[PDB]
Amino acid sequence: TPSIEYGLLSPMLIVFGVAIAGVLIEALAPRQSRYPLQVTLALGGLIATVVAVVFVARGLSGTPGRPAVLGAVVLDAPAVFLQGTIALVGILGIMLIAERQKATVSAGEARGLEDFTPQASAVAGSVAEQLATKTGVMQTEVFPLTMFAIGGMLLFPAADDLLTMFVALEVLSLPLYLLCGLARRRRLLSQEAALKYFLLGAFSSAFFIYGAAMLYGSAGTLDLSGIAESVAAGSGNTSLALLGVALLLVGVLFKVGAVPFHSWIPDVYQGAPTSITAFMAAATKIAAFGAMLRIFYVAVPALRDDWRPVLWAIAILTMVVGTVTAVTQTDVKRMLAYSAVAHSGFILTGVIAANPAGVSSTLFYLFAYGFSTLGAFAVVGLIRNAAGDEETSMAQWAGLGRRYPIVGVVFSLFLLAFAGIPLTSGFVSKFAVFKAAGEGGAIPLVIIGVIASAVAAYFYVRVIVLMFFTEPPDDAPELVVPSGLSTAVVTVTAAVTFALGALPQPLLDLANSAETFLH
């Protein structure tokens, strides 16, 4: 019989079982009790996942990783590190998702402070939507779907086979496609975002599977270890291998947001629910870059001389176009999305390093940046126009910091982390990736990313200018708490973003210990 390492799969199994249990709650639980259970089932579940991870991590203190399901899944140090990062980010994202309306005379608060329309199938602004809002109904199906996303995402770094990694890509993509279209406010934009994300993601996934086919043809094996053995031994075709690497790179780059594939990120981040947008921008990037790391440092290191240049052309672009485009942006959400494109480029610079320092720097970069992005988007979700819609217009943020100094300082901290100012986790993060690139002979990327960061500092700083140095307008937006969960998310995220800047050696030792994959 096939040996199954349940202990190693423990975090993944916990997450997927919790998702299935949440679907059961949706099925056979009364409406009034669905939300208390789901969130309780969800957050606790993720907490268990985190616990599982550390246990697995401790188990990995011996063998340098080990396959779990007869290949097709490998939990080595990078895999467990990324899984723990994704688990923490998912906990925070679900706490953001579970936020309900602050308070009202009627008890019909409907998970709206998290931007989720009470009835997604209901037409925007229709009498049915208004009645659903009044009755306080909520589609708790969000919590299962989100868990599934996390599930697939937890798998995506750990997938040691092309088939499993493709399945994980689809499993994480579909729930996100659905979630993009559930926004409570600006429903038309959210539905457009869902459609765009679905179309481009399906297109990219077709490319990903075609590349997997090409790699399988070249190497005659789907395990990444087998592909590496074949390409190194020269047994493969060596042209199908390169073509498959390119096509698979297309899919992963789309998932992370390289410039040739970035265009979806701005629209999707602007249109998707703010909580979903935050959780996405952090954890999906983490998972996609984990898979990319596995592909390049395990599956196909031998062809470094072949794919190294291509990534250069992308990384440069991702640093340039991602930043230069953000310069003229006037929407906070859109500006942050372009910032995410640029930070994908910065990650790719470390990935290009092709050295263990590259792996460690990328892992730390992903952790710190995922936290910073989650916090920034969570904060953005609180700036509410008079009508209640998120005042994403940057001009409307003028004097926001003066009205709300604490939230303003927190958002400025996140912005400076993105800009990579020292004493912020962002600087340690950028320094790690650029140092890894320099040690890897890619110091021209260090220079170009330095210039790109200088450019991006402008649009990171303009927000602070509006927020603090400008007098508030007459119709300036107002904060909405809206509950303890959102404040906890924001404070935890800011605390991490500051601690990893001041005192990064913690978790940097962890990143260093996870600089080696189970080749």
């Binding site: 481009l200 690497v245 052309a313």
Partner: protein, 57 residues
């Protein structure tokens, strides 16, 4: 005059160039899913780059 037009002029020109390039690039974000799909299919650039890396640049 040198300070106001030449020295400050270089920084002003750099900023103007960055702004013009930003506007041009933002014009690429047409908002049509099909245009984004075309850009992604520009991944033929990735394919040809990977192949040519073996064809001596």
């Amino acid at each position: 005059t040198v300070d106001d037009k030449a020295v400050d002029g270089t920084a002003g020109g750099l900023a103007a160039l960055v702004s013009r390039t930003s506007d041009a690039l933002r014009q690429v974000q047409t908002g049509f899913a099909r245009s984004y799909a075309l850009s992604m299919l520009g991944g033929s650039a990735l394919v040809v780059a990977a192949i040519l890396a073996v064809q001596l640049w």
